[PDB]
Amino acid sequence: VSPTRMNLLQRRGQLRLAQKGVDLLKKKRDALVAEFFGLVREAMEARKALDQAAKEAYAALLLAQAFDGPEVVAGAALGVPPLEGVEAEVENVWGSKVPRLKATFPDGALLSPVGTPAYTLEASRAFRRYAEALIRVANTETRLKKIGEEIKKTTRRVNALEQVVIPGIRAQIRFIQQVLEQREREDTFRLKRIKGKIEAREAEEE
Amino acid sequence: MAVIADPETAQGFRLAGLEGYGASSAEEAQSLLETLVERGGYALVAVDEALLPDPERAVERLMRGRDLPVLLPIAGLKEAFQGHDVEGYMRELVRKTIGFDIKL
Amino acid sequence: DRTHPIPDLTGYITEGQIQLSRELHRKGIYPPIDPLPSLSRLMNNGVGKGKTREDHKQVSDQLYSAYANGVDIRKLVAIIGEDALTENDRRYLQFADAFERFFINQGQQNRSIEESLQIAWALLSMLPQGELKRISKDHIGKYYGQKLEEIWGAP
Amino acid sequence: NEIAAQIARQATVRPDLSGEGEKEEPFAVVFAAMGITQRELSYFIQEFERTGALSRSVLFLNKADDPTIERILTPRMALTVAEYLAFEHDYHVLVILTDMTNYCEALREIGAAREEIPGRRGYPGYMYTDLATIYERAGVVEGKKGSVTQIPILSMPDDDRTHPIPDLTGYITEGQIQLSRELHRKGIYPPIDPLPSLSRLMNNGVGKGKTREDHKQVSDQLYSAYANGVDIRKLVAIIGEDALTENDRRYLQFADAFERFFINQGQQNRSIEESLQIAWALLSMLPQGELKRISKDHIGKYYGQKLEEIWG
Amino acid sequence: DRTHPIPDLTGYITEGQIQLSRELHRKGIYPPIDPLPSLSRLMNNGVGKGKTREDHKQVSDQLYSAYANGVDIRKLVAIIGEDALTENDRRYLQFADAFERFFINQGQQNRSIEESLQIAWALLSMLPQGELKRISKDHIGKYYGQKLEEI
Amino acid sequence: PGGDMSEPVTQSTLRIVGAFWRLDASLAFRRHFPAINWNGSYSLFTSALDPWYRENVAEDYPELRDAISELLQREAGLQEIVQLVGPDALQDAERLVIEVGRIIREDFLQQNAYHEVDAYCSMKKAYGIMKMILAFYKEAEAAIKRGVSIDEILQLPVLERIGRARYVSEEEFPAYFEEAMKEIQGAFKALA
Amino acid sequence: PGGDMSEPVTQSTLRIVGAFWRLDASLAFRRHFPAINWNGSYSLFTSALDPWYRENVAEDYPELRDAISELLQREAGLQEIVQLVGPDALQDAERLVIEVGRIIREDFLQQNAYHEVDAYCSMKKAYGIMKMILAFYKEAEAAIKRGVSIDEILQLPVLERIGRARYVSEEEFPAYFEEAMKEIQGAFKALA
Amino acid sequence: PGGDMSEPVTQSTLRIVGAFWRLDASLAFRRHFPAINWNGSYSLFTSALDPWYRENVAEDYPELRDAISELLQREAGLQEIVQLVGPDALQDAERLVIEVGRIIREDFLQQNAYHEVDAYCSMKKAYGIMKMILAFYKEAEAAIKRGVSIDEILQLPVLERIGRARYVSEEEFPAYFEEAMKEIQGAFKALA
């Protein structure tokens, strides 16, 4: 940056803009943090529901293998073929696409859900509900993580502005001010010396 | 959507029509997770917390460019009937997300 | 440049500054006085009971704070959007717009202190009674609730 | 100095394009050196010897070991000779003045010795008039076939364009070719920074019947594209590369390829046709809609050729 | 500011300078001497075999390198936080903090050269035995290992 | 000297002139002419010339000019946020302001002194271009409120007409302007 | 005064001298000696000395020197990103470039003026150190493309030998260099 | 004129004066009076005045003052966390630090110049208030290590008694003081 008055004014404008940008990003981060701490409560509820559903479904399965022979129940359970029910649509949260698992998961898709065991059909119902709870937990956690990453980005930007950019502009301002003041001092000294020489000439020779 | 967990819950998940597999050891769990994640079409690959706590920490190298398959730690059956500190899990997740590690 | 010797010494000898805004000027507002950088050191002596009205100082402080918040939120909306703001934030946004359009933009009209305070209270009514933390409850009960149509109908 | 020597070696007019009668009279070179070091002087002398250009050159040499006050006369004598040749023997002279910074230093010495009131940074207030009396002796005259072209070389003390010497020279001269240190470090030769460079008279000698119909529009489009590329370079230092749109990345690649293929040519002599071909090959990286400055006829005629066909 | 004429002209004349840090002073560290801007030109002519101990100069150089790394990683952490650090960077941060707390901060206590070198080697012991490029293998074998337990 | 507008001569001229056409080095470097710094320029004759414009150019010409000035001011405000976070971080309603400012500065304020037609512009032609731009802005804002993305709004073919309005001859412009207005309305009706 | 390079004396000198050896206070603070800023320094004698280098050091010394210079330039380019975004963000190739730049700085550029052996360095010794560094760089780049990890590369023993090459005697250097090159090949042969 | 501390007069003054009391408008905006900032102010007389304090106010007064300073410094360090996440988010220990800082600021550092009794404070009164605050902090740390939630700590009336210590007369303060100390010990022992 060349030391000139207009460059000094430009640097000062950059300083003011950087400070205002720090304030703006701080407000953005406050909004993000509020949303994040709401999402944390949502995630807590979702995980509690998942725990309840897991307990119920596992209890159903255990009693499925208790009233019926474990081998027969296990064979029946493994006889159900795998299937796809999830749709991996995307939702735009804070300018960032995030997956949303809008799964249909039809009940009629399953094959051989019941057989010789009596309760095994009910067990499949509990595990289907547990899969639904798992998908809910996924939907909550993914967007929570995205909000967290956005907060990290904003904090990195704010810290960069406050620890690198602004000190640099301040240093440049100081340097240009010193250069300009030195030039002014030199000009004044030259004028004074020339004026004194002229006065001496007038006194000596008029 | 797939689940790698203990066989008892894995077979129940299969009974729910979801792809699933058993697990025996942390290295085996990681190998199974890598095998699943390598192939496509799987949007959700759950994992037990007992054998592989942080699935992202394990298979980050694979999906960082193809993040469609979500990962989700799933409750351990051993702790299922004695309770687990969900609050602790979210404390760890908040620490992972914002770094401050502060809450009450 | 406020650091030029002339403005600097004038401020160093005088008792405030009313600063004109190029942004307000080029948005069409006249007279373009920016309240935020303006100051009048001796104001607190010449406002109150027996001079102006008993609610002058607090109305002025509330107006200052509300306009500052409105400007900040106006810059935040460009990034975050309006749907991600709280309702109070949107009210501050609308307050900033109305403040610029009706308080600063008076044209060649001549306003008595009563008319100006009436407009100020009408603008403050656009915010919930409860975010007006700088005004005492007596003044709020006395003056809160006017309608902006008193000036919006004939700016 | 390398760029000046290269221009002296390669400079030629193109009667074929302009329609003038077939003629190949070479330039005469008047080389006025002020405070030139033995290194630079040896370079210049060897280059002129190699190109066989001394037989049509007159050299005025004021070395760095010589008196400083002689510099007040060297440019004037050189330009007297150049004007004589041009306007009394129909020559096409090319005057090179090695360091005008040294001339201004001598000017300041004499000014301070006389105890005058200086202007900026001690330089005399009449430096503008002095440098004008030197620079304004170039041109072409009505009813005469000769010409005088000046290519002064001056070092900006600390790469400062606001220093008095560069400022006054720019206000007097008809443009300037400004070199950049950033390009130099990358390895680009000649390291000409097009954005700060300028040529006031470019519009006189380019166009239909002079060089080609697309010269001005191509130049303007290149300037626009390079400015956009530099702006995106600045942005990526704030946002990161992964967030750039496809268009921004296109412009960034254009800036890089422009820098590495158009500016960086080494010591090779390019005809205007090859230069415009490379320019069009570079503009072909941007989408056709981006070329706002160029008319659609020229785009249809010249757009499309790939940069690979020239190199790689 | 060093670039003021008085410090600048003193620096070109004197044989080094002991610079004080306002940050260390605000943290409550006495004497608040920041090694990085401080130098002693005639150091090498008064330390070594028969002039104190043979490991003095290399220990000093290693301390300077380690503290510079720690300061760099501290600058980085103020931007990107602590979790994103490698184990090596974490060790260097811990070394920088322990350096400021135990080596620079000594209050009014008069330390023998041997005590100071013992503390320095204890601080260097916090780093891997292979990160000490400035110290010859013999000295590292001789002194590496003690814990921060000086009393 | 040095492009420093703080020089004594410039400052003495500021206080005695009624119009100030400040030139920018940034614009000149990228060959954007006339290269007038809109932010630093001003005119004190605008209010005194309004009756003439109303009687000679158009009755609502001052309103159009004020609208253009306000749009440029909003762009100047948003450039700070752009430099802070980038154009993609902005919302659609503000990206529209940014891009309309670009359209003004490339298709209206730009002028080619060496072009046979664009070297000279009449108040009527400038009025027509301004009305085109403001009509497009109104339609685009209304559409963005309906849910159309800014990427589509930028790809419409009518922007080419607005861009080439400069190069149309004085005799041709009166019909080209009506055609362009009809095309603007039709193009935005097509988006729906 | 103040390390300011815009001063009359420095500017007067720089118009005549054929080289420019710029010392940096920042490097001296971190005890990086000779503390020469390789970004601001320059020499106008490099092209003139190429034949002598070719006939007295090695036929490919200039190419090796250019390779080291390019690596330093790339490291300088990536420092601006790293200082703000963190090393982990960079891809594997950029990480390797930065770590090799650190190796070049600490193992080649730095020189102890008070060491019995490091105080002096012949051109052959510098050529050997440069060739070692560039051979390791090529092997590391190939390994990274072959799926090896950067953390694994950064812990190889051969790095220590490269880092102590400058403390080896002039008479012992050729054997040290042969052994080091063999081990550079071997270390990445084992990694595969 | 501008409030810059680099001005020659301020720099020359700070070179010669032994104390600097930084009045700040930001505190006054928060209704904190006297509006003296404790993070930019300093005194160079404390070490020389320590013996007088040990003989005239109390033998442990300097250590208590140092403890108060350390608490204020800690609470300054925690601001970067309280800003991003409110006080409710902070854990019990950090919340205790924040709230002991609030108590200090509100009950020892604030002083109403227009009050009959609070306008003047003797050294004994200040020492008593500091001792009360520090004793409360010690007991509260013990409680937090015992498992008492901080929301329970903040409800104790002993905090209200410390709130009014400022406003007790000099001739009455001794009684109030030992009484309040006894009730401080009583509160946390009784609290479960």
Features:
part of a larger assembly, 8 chains, C: 155 residues, mainly alpha, 7 helices, 2 strands, 52% helix, globular, F: 192 residues, two-stranded antiparallel sheet, 2% strand, V-type ATP synthase alpha chain (chains F, G, H)
The general outline of chain B is: globular
Overall outline of chain C: globular
Task: Sketch the topology of chain B as an H/E string, one letter per element.
Answer: EHEHEHEHH
The multimeric state of the shown protein is part of a larger assembly
Provide the spatial order of strands within the biggest beta sheet of chain B. Answer: 2-1-3-4
Number of helical segments of chain C?
A: 7
Query: How much is the radius of gyration of chain C in Å?
Result: 17 Å
> Which structural class do the helices and strands of chain B define?
alpha/beta
Strand order of the largest sheet of chain C: 1-2
Largest sheet of chain C: 2 strands, antiparallel
- Beta-strand fraction estimate of chain C: under 5%
Q: Give the helix tally of chain B.
A: 5
- Per DSSP E runs of 2 or more residues, the count of β-strands of chain C stands at 2
Number of domain units of chain B:
1
- Beta percentage of chain B is 15-25%
How do the strands and helices of this protein lay out in sequence?
The structure is cut from a larger assembly and holds one copy of chain A (206 residues), one copy of chain B (104 residues), three copies of chain C and three copies of chain F (192 residues).
Chain A: H1 5-67, H2 70-79, E1 88-92, E2 97-101, H3 120-205
Antiparallel strand pairs in A: 1-2
Chain B: E1 2-4, H1 7-15, E2 19-21, H2 26-38, E3 44-48, H3 55-63, E4 70-74, H4 77-80, H5 86-98
Helix pairs in contact in B: 2-3
Chain C: H1 5-13, E1 16-17, H2 22-26, E2 39-40, H3 56-80, H4 87-104, H5 113-124, H6 137-143, H7 149-152
Antiparallel strand pairs in C: 1-2
Give a structural overview.
This is part of a larger assembly, with one copy of chain A (206 residues), one copy of chain B (104 residues), three copies of chain C and three copies of chain F (192 residues). Chain A is mainly alpha-helical and 206 residues long. Chain A has three helices and two strands; from the N terminus they run ααββα. In chain A, helix 1 packs antiparallel against helix 3. Chain C is mostly helical and 155 residues long. In chain C, helix 3 packs across helix 4, helix 3 packs across helix 5 and helix 4 packs antiparallel against helix 5. Chain F is mostly helical and 192 residues long. Chain F has nine helices and two strands, in the order αβαβααααααα. In chain F, helix 5 packs antiparallel against helix 6 and helix 6 packs parallel to helix 9. Chains A and B meet through helix 1, helix 2 and helix 3 of A and helix 1, strand 4 and helix 5 of B. Chains F, G, H: Produces ATP from ADP in the presence of a proton gradient across the membrane. The V-type alpha chain is a catalytic subunit. Chains F, G, H: Belongs to the ATPase alpha/beta chains family.
